[PDB]
Coordinates of C-alpha atoms and ligand atoms in Angstrom, one line a residue:
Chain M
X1 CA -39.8 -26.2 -1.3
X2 CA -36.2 -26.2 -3.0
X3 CA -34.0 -24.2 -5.9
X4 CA -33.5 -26.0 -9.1
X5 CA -30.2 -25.0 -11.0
X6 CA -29.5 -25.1 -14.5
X7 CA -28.0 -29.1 -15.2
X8 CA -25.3 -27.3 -17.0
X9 CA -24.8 -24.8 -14.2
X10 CA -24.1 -27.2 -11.6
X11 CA -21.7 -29.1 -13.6
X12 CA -19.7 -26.1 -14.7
X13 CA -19.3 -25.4 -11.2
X14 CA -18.8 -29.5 -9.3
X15 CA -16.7 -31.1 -12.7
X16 CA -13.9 -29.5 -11.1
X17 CA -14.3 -30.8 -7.6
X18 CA -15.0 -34.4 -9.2
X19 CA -12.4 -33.4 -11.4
X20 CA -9.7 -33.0 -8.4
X21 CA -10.7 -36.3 -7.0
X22 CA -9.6 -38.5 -10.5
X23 CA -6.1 -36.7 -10.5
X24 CA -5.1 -38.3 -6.8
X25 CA -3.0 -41.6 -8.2
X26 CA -3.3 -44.1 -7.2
X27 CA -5.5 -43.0 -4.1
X28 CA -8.7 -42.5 -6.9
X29 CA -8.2 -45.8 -8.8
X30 CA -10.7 -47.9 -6.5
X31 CA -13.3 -45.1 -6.7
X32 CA -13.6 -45.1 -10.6
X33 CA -15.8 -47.7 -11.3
X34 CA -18.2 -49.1 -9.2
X35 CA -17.0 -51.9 -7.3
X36 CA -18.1 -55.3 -9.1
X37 CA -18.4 -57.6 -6.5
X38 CA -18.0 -60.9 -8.9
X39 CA -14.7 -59.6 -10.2
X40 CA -12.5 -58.2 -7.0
X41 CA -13.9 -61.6 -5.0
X42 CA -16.2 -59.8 -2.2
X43 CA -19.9 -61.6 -2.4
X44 CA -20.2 -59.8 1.2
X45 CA -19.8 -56.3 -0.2
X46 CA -24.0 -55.9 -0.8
X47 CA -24.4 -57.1 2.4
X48 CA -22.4 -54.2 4.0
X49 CA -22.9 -51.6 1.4
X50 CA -27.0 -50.9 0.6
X51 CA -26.7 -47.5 -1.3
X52 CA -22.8 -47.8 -3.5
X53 CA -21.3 -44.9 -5.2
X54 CA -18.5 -44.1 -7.3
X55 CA -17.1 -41.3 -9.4
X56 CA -18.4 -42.5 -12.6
X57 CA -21.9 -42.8 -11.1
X58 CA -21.3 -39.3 -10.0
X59 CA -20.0 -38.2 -13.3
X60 CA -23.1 -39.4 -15.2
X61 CA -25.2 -37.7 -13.1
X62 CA -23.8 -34.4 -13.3
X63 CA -23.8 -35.5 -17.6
X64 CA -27.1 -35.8 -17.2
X65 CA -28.6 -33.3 -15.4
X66 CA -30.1 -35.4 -12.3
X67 CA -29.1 -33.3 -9.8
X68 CA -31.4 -30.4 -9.0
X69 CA -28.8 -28.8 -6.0
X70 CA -25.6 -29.3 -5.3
X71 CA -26.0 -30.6 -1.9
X72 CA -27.4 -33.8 -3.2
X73 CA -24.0 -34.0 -5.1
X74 CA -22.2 -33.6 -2.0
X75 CA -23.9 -36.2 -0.3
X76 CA -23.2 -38.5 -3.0
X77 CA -19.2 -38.1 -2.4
X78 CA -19.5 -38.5 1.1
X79 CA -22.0 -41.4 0.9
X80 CA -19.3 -43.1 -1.6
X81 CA -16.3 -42.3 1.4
X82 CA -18.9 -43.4 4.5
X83 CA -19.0 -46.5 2.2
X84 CA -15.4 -47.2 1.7
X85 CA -15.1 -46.3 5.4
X86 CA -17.5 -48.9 6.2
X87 CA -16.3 -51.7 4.4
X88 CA -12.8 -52.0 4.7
X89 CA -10.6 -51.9 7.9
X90 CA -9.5 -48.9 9.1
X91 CA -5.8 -50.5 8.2
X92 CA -6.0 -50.9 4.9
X93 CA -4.7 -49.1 1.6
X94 CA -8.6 -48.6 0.6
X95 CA -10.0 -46.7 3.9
X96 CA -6.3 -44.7 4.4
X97 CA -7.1 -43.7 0.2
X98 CA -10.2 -42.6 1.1
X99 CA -9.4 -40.9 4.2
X100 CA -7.0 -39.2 1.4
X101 CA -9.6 -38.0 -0.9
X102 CA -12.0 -36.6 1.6
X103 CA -9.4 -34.0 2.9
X104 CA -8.6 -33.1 -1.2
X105 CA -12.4 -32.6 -1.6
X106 CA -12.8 -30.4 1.7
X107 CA -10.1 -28.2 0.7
X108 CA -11.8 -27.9 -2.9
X109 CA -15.6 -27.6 -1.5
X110 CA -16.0 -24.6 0.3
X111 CA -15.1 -21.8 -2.1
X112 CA -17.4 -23.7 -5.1
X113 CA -20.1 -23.6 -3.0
X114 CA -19.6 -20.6 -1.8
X115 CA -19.4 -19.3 -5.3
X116 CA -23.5 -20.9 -5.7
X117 CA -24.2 -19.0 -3.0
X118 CA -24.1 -21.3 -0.2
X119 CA -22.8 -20.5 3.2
X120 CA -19.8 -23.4 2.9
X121 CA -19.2 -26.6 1.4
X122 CA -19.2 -28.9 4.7
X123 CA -21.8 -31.7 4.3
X124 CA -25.4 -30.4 4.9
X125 CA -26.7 -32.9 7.7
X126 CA -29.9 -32.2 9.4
X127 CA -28.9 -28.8 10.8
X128 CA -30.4 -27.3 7.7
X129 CA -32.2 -23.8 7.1
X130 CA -34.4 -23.4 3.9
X131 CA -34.4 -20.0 2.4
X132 CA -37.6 -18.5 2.0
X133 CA -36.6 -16.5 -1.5
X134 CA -34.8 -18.7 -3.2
X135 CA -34.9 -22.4 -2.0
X136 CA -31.2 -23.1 -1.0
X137 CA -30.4 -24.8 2.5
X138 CA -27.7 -23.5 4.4
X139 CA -26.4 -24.5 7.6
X140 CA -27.8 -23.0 10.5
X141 CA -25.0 -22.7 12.5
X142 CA -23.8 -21.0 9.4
X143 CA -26.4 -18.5 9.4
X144 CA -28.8 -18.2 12.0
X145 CA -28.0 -15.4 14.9
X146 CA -29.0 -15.3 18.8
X147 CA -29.2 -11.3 17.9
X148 CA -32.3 -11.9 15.0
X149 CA -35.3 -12.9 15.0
X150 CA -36.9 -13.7 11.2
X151 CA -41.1 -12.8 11.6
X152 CA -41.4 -14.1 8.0
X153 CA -38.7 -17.2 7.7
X154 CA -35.0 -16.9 7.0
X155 CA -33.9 -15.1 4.0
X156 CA -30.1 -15.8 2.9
X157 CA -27.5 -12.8 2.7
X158 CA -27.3 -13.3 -1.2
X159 CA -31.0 -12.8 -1.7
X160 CA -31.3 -9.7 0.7
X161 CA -28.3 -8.0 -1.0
X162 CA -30.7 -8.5 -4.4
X163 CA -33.1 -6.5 -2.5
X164 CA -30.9 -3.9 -1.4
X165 CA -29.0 -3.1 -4.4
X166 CA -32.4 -2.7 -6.4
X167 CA -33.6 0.0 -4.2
X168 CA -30.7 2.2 -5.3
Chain I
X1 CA -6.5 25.8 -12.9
X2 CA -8.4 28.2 -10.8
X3 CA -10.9 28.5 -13.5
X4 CA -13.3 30.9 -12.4
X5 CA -13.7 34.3 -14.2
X6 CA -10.4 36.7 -13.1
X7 CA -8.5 33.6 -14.3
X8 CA -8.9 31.7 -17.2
X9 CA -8.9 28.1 -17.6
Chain K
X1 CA -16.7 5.3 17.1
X2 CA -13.8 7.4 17.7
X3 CA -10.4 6.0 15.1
X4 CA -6.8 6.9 15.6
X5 CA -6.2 9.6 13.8
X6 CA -3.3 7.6 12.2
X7 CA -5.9 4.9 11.1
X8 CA -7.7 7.6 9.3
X9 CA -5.5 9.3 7.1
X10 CA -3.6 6.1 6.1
X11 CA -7.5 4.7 5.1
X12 CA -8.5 7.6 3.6
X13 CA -5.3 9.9 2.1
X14 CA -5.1 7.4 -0.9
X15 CA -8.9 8.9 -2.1
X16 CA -7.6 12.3 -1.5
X17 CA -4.3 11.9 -3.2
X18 CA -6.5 10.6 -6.2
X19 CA -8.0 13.9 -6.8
X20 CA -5.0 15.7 -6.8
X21 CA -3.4 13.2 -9.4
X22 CA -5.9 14.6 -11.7
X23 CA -4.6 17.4 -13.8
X24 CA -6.2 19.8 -14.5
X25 CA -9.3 19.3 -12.9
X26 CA -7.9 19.3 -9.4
X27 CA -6.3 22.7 -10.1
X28 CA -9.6 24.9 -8.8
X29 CA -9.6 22.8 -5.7
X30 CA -6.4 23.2 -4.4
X31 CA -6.7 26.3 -2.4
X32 CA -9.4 27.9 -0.8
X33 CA -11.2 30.2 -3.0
X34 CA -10.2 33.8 -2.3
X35 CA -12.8 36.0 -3.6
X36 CA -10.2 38.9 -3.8
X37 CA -7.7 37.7 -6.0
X38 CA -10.0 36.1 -8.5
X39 CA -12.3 39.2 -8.4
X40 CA -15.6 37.4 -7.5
X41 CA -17.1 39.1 -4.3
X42 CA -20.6 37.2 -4.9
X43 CA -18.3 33.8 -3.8
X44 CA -19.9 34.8 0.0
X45 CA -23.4 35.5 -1.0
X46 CA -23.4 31.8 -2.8
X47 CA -21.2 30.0 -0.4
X48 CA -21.9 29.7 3.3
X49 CA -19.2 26.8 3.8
X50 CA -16.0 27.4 1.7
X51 CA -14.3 23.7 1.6
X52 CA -10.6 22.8 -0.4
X53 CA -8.3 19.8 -0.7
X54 CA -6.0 21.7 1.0
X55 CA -8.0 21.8 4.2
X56 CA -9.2 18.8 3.9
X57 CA -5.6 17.4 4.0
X58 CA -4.8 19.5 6.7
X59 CA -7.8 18.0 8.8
X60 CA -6.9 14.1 8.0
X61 CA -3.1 15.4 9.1
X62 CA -3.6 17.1 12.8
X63 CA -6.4 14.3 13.0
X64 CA -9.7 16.5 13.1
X65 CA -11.8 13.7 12.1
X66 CA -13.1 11.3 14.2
X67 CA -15.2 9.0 11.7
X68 CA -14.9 8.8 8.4
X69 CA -18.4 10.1 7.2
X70 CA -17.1 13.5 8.2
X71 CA -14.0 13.1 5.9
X72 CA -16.9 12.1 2.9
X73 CA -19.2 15.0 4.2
X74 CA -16.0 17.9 3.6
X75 CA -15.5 16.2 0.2
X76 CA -19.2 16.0 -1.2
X77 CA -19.4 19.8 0.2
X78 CA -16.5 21.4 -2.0
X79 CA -18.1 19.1 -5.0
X80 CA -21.5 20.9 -3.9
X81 CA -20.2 24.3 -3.5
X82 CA -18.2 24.4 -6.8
X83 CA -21.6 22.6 -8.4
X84 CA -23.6 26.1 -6.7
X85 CA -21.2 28.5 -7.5
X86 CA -20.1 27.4 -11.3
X87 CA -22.4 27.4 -14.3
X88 CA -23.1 23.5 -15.6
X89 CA -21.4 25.1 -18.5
X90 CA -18.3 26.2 -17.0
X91 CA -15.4 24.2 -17.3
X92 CA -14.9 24.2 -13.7
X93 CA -18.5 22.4 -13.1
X94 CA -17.0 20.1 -15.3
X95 CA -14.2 19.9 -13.4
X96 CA -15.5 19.2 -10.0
X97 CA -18.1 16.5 -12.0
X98 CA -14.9 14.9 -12.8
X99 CA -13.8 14.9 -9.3
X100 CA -16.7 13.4 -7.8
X101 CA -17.1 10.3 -10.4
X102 CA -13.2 9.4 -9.5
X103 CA -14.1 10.3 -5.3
X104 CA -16.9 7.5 -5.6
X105 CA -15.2 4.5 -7.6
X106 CA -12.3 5.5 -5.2
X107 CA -14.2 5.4 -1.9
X108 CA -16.7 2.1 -1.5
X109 CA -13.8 0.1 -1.3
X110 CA -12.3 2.5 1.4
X111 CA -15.1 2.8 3.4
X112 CA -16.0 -1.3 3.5
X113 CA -12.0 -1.7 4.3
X114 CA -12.9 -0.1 7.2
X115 CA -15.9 -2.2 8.2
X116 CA -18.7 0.2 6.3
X117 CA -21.5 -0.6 4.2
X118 CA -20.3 1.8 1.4
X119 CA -19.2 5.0 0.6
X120 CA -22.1 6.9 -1.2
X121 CA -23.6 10.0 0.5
X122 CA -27.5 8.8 1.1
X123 CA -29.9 9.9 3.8
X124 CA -29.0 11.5 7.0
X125 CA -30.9 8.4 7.8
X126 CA -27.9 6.2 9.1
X127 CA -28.1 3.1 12.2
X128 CA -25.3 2.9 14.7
X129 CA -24.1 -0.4 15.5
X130 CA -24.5 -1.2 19.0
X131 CA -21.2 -3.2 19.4
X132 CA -18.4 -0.8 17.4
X133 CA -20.0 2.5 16.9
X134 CA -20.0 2.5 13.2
X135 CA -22.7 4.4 11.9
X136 CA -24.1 2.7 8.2
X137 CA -26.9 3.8 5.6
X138 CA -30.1 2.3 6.9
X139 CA -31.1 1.6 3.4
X140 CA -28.1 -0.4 3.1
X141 CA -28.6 -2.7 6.4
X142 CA -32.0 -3.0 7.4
X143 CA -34.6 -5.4 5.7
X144 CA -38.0 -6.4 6.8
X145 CA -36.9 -9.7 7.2
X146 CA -34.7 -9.2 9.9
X147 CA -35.6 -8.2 13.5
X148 CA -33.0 -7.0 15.8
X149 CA -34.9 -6.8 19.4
X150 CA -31.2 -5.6 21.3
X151 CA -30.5 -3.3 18.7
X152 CA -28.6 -3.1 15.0
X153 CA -25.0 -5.4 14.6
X154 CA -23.0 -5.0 12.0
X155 CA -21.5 -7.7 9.8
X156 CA -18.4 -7.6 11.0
X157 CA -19.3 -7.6 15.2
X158 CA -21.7 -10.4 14.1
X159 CA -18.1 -12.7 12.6
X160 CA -16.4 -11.5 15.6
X161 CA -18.6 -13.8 18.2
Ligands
LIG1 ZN1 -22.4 -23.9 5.9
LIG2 ZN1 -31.9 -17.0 -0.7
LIG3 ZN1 -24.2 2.6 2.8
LIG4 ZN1 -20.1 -3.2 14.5

């Protein structure tokens, strides 16, 4: 079960993804610290928002090496927008700055995960399939093919091009 | 060219 | 799979027009041998298939190819015949040696522009793909891991739907 990257790996590859989000002004500025109830006047934030998020949360973690595969990083920027989402109206400058970042990190996604050898950069969901080789989930609509059938479990395209070029 | 004996290089 | 001829020789007349930049090694290849005026009869008794650049060009111009393995085929059999012929020695050998590492940086690139898995001669051991006609190296496609009960699809048929 799973691939484990390099700590370093993964944040030579996501800083710049992170990275993309903290240069939107001002629509970044209430995603930079985590939101501190007490101060900003909303007691009723922990009562909407179980599981909070931010980009220096994010940062630290990539610092220090506590993600194990990029997905997980991914769902931590879309669990802090679902967040933002959730708590404020649709109408205000927060949710319409968040809807702003999510389309910045889309655009930037794809091709970085691509580049780890993933199939895209979309968030995984549960529509997952685990490759047998190497441990990285890819989407099954992604991958997967009415034409194939897999007798020993799915084996990504990266991993059986490995194969292929070492019997030449 | 044509480098094949009768010519030479 | 059948190609336009036009398809063809705009694909593939930038691999043959890199040989002939190659002075002098390209020089032997440009004709067809002719035993007579170089005064080697034994040519024949060596050579069953003469092969040139010139007749290759001719071929990729009145459109005698119908798939580009053939075009590959023609060039690996002047590299072979010269290779038979000339002593590893000769300067020629060396020559055509020449030719062939240039032919294959020049041609994976080529061949996968036009939906191929690469440009190498292998096997005769090739799979057609049962959508386009495209014939690739079974070595290259195949794996255990994958089971194709309606036959072989290529990469490229598979994006497609
Ligand atoms: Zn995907
Ligand atoms: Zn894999
Ligand atoms: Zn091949
Ligand atoms: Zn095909």
């Amino acid at each position: 079960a799973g691939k484990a990257f390099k700590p370093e790996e993964l944040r030579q590859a996501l800083m710049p993804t992170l990275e993309a989000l903290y240069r939107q002004d001002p629509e970044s500025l209430p995603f930079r610290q985590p939101v501190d109830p007490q101060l900003l006047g909303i007691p009723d934030y922990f009562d909407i928002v179980k599981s909070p998020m931010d980009l220096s949360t994010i940062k630290r973690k990539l610092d220090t090496g506590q993600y194990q595969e990029p997905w997980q990083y991914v769902d931590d920027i879309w669990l802090m927008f679902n967040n933002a989402w959730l708590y404020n109206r649709k109408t205000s400058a927060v949710y319409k700055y968040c809807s702003k970042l999510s389309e910045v990190f889309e655009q930037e996604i794809d091709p970085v995960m691509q580049s780890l050898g993933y199939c895209c950069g979309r968030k995984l969901g549960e529509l997952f399939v685990e490759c047998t080789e190497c441990g990285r989930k890819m989407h099954q609509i992604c991958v997967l093919h009415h034409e194939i059938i897999w007798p020993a479990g799915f084996v990504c395209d990266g991993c059986l091009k490995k194969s292929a070029r070492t019997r030449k | 060219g044509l480098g094949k004996g009768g010519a030479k290089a």
